[PDB]
Amino acid sequence: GTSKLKYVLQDARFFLIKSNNHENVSLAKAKGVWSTLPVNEKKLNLAFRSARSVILIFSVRESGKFQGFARLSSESHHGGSPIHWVLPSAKMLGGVFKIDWICRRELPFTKSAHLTNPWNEHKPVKIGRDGQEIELECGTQLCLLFPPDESIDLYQVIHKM
Ligand SMILES: CNc1nc(Cl)nc2c1ncn2Cc1ccccc1N
Numbered sequence: 001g002t003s004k005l006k007y008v009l010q011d012a013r014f015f016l017i018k019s020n021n022h023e024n025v026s027l028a029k030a031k032g033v034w035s036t037l038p039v040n041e042k043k044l045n046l047a048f049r050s051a052r053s054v055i056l057i058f059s060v061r062e063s064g065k066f067q068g069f070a071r072l073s074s075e076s077h078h079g080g081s082p083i084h085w086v087l088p089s090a091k092m093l094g095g096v097f098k099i100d101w102i103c104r105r106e107l108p109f110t111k112s113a114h115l116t117n118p119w120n121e122h123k124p125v126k127i128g129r130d131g132q133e134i135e136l137e138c139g140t141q142l143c144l145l146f147p148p149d150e151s152i153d154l155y156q157v158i159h160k161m
């Protein structure tokens with residue numbers, strides 16, 4: 001069902017993540033981590049302290065789709081490991097956030113054409129730069145459009161909250 005998902009999304013904040021390649025999204029799905037540029041790392045660290053859930057909604061550039069969404073489980077941390085990101089430098093991708101995936105399924109942009117983002121001039125929610133915040137109502141509805149991911153149990157995510 002969608003009840004636990006709605007509970008996780010309650011009062012959440014949402015950010016669009018735009019990746020240049022599929023490989024880093026695949027690596028993020030396998031290892032539960034994400035890294036971004038310092039402008040956005042600063043924004044996400046602020047958001048993580050400010051909200052019960054911070055949701056990253058991923059889209060690979062030129063794919064015409066979102067590739068899923070995940071909840072931040074930590075602020076960014078340095079050292080830890082050298083993630084083999086297919087770097088589009090490595091020093092700008094230090095700072096690793098831990099993330100718990102909520103949905104690893106794809107959603108085509110054609111399915112979100114009815115959703116506009118107030119924080120980006122009411123452009124369709126697919127439009128935005130890496131790090132663009134998505135207002136609560138639009139982000140909630142976007143996440144609810146994804147196909148359910150029955151391989152994921154939200155019970156442990158609710159306990160992180
Ligand atoms: C693992 N993290 C990332 N991996 C990839 Cl392949 N692209 C990213 C990532 N974070 C942001 N972008 C998009 C981008 C690429 C290059 C210059 C500026 C911007 N915004």
